[PDB]
Design a protein around this nucleic acid. Structure first.
Ligand SMILES: Nc1nc2c(ncn2[C@H]2CC[C@@H](COP(=O)(O)OP(=O)(O)OP(=O)(O)O)O2)c(=O)[nH]1
Ligand SMILES: [Mg+2]
Ligand SMILES: [Mg+2]
Ligand SMILES: [Zn+2]
Length: 572
DNA sequence: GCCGTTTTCGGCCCGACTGTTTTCAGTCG
């Protein structure tokens, strides 16, 4: 991938232009193209390999954001970006990333106190300079200090799974606040986006001041950036930004739509409303002053001539077009999943025994659970050897016969060597119920080699699932360089399923690689990669990722019952 | 700079919070 650089490059063209006072809509052309490319997990040049007049087609991208890309790879750099660089100091971009700052304030600060970096800004307030500026007051200076200090505690975006459980605690607390008729977790959290920038809570209330004052009073709250009658922005005792939005109960449905987004999806709907002479806000759909919809989401979407769109689809990735023409995808649902196909145990890196896993699986209402432990490669040991994997399969057999349902499947997560060979001999793989293969080494391999390595792993006829394929770690490590079309092509042809690993720091396949695979007709496997019984609660996230990728119950191994899973497995 | 089951040109989402703004601009979701 190289989206991460080019996402920053347009983001910079937009910001430098925004500083120079450019056409705001041209500015927004870049900002959007920045957001979609960074969110794009399928490598861009793999899509750009066919660009040309078909680059005029991509997503949120037109002809002008193409000849610049024609230029980009032809010459390594876009003149527009370089032209803007000469007019706008590199450090002013950093200053206007500070929440509350923006173009006009960054410019005033530059021409006023010559501030052109965070380091300089930091010095300016500590010294107390901005409280002297002509127009920039002492109150407006405290505003900057807030935003400057509050940008730091909230470091990176956080994986959804890292904050999920906390989010539900806060939700249950907000539902118990006086004045709160009804509350819900919206924003990116509700769309199951693999990472979040904050947590966005909507509240139905008729005494909104009470609820906001009640919300900020929660013990996890550390600071308050902004606080009004209807909304508040706060940061927790751990850095995580949390926003509250209050709306009257009559507009609850329009409030859910508003706070759930995405921005881009929301803008499609409002733009649509304009075509039909209507207005869409948080308060409802309106024809003139007459509110035609608001109480619920269903009827709000109906007001725009649309069926209800599930939150995970709301990324303006074709869900609106598919809603107009009445062909929304049928989506997987959590109760349809009848087991977890990658959990670990005390046999290797897990914290749990078979009894502990079985008990956890039964409690959740699972039909089965695959106990897949690491191959020797994880440590490179010689005893634990391949010999005693048979006794492990034997021990799990007797466990099933004595306990009954749910059933433990004897599995294994087998390392893929740098050449594509597997960490376990074939006779060991032959007698395993579930065989997962995955990469835990040599990530910097060139695209072509990493493809060959993966392809040879798929030629092994005992392989059932290709586990967390990209090998990424959210915040720690990028995806491996690989031609994923060829890899999914091969896996399909060999009947191997691709894994959506719901473990909080993996979330791999990502939504849009998952949507690609499933679109090609591949089978899918869902797991949590659990090392403690807590982790089994991540199935929700793999499902949500499945949902984001327009994936239904068809060709998903977890929706099969115990018997049908074994058939599928026993028939290689 | 994108973009068209009412458009290939003329628009481009809508409203809350903050500050020194006496009538609204800046920045944000
Ligand atoms: N109409 C409209 N809605 C917006 C705009 N910006 C944000 N929203 C809505 C959509 C989602 C909701 C929360 O905004 P966030 O900034 O939290 O974005 P998010 O979608 O939750 O993602 P993130 O994980 O980055 O927070 O507010 C906008 O410019 N216009
Ligand atoms: Mg959010
Ligand atoms: Mg937010
Ligand atoms: Zn693994």
């Amino acid at each position: 991938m190289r989206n991460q650089e080019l996402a920053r490059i347009f983001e910079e063209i937009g910001l430098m232009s925004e500083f120079l006072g450019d056409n705001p809509f041209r500015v927004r052309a870049y900002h959007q193209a920045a957001r979609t490319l960074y969110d794009l997990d399928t490598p861009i040049e793999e899509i750009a390999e066919k660009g040309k007049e078909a680059l005029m087609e991509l997503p949120g991208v037109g002809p002008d954001l193409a000849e610049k890309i024609l230029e980009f790879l032809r010459t390594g750099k876009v003149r527009k970006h370089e032209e803007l660089s000469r007019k706008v100091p590199r450090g002013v971009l950093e200053v206007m990333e500070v929440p509350g700052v923006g173009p006009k304030t960054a410019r005033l600060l530059y021409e006023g106190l010559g501030i052109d970096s965070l380091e300089k800004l930091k010095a300016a307030l500590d010294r107390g300079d901005l409280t002297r500026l002509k127009g920039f007051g002492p109150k407006r200076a405290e505003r900057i200090r807030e935003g400057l200090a509050l940008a730091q505690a909230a470091g990176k975006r956080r994986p959804l799974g890292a904050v999920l459980s906390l989010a539900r605690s806060l939700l249950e607390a907000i539902r118990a606040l006086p004045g709160v008729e009804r509350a819900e977790l919206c924003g990116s959290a509700r769309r199951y986006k693999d990472t979040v920038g904050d947590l966005d809570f909507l509240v139905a209330s008729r005494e909104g001041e009470r609820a906001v004052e009640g919300f900020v009073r929660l013990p996890q709250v550390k600071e308050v950036y902004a606080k009004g009658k209807e909304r508040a922005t706060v940061f927790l005792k751990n850095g995580l930004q949390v926003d509250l939005r209050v709306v009257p109960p009559e507009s609850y449905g329009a409030g859910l739509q508003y706070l759930t987004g995405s921005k881009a999806h929301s803008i499609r709907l409002r733009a649509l409303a304009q075509e039909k002479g209507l207005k869409l806000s948080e308060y409802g759909v309106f024809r003139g002053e007459k509110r035609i919809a608001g109480e619920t989401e269903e009827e709000v979407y109906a007001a725009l001539g649309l069926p209800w769109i599930p939150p995970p689809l709301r990324e303006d990735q074709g869900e609106v077009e598919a809603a107009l023409e009445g062909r929304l995808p049928k989506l997987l649902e959590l109760p349809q999943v009848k087991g977890d196909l990658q959990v670990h145990s005390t046999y290797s890196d897990g914290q749990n025994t078979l009894e502990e896993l079985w008990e956890a699986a039964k409690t959740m209402g699972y039909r089965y659970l695959a106990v897949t432990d690491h191959s020797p490669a994880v440590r490179v040991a010689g005893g634990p050897s391949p010999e005693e994997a048979l006794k492990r399969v034997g021990e799990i057999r007797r466990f099933n016969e004595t306990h009954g349902p749910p059933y433990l499947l004897a599995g294994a997560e087998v390392d893929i060597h740098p050449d594509g060979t597997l960490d376990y001999p074939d006779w060991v793989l032959r007698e395993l119920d579930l065989v997962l293969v995955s990469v835990h080494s040599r990530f910097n391999l060139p695209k072509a080699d990493q493809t060959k390595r993966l392809l040879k792993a798929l030629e092994n006829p005992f392989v059932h699932v290709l586990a967390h394929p990209t090998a990424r770690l959210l915040g720690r490590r990028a995806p491996i360089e690989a031609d994923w079309e060829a890899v999914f092509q091969k896996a399909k042809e060999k009947g191997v399923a691709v894994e959506i690993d719901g473990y909080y720091d993996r979330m791999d396949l990502p939504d849009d690689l998952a949507r690609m695979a499933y679109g090609m007709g591949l089978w899918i496997s869902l797991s949590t990669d659990a090392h403690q019984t807590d982790h089994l609660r991540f199935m929700e996230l793999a499902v949500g990722t499945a949902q984001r990728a327009w994936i239904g119950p068809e060709r998903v191994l977890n929706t099969l019952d115990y018997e049908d899973l074994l058939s599928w497995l026993k028939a290689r």
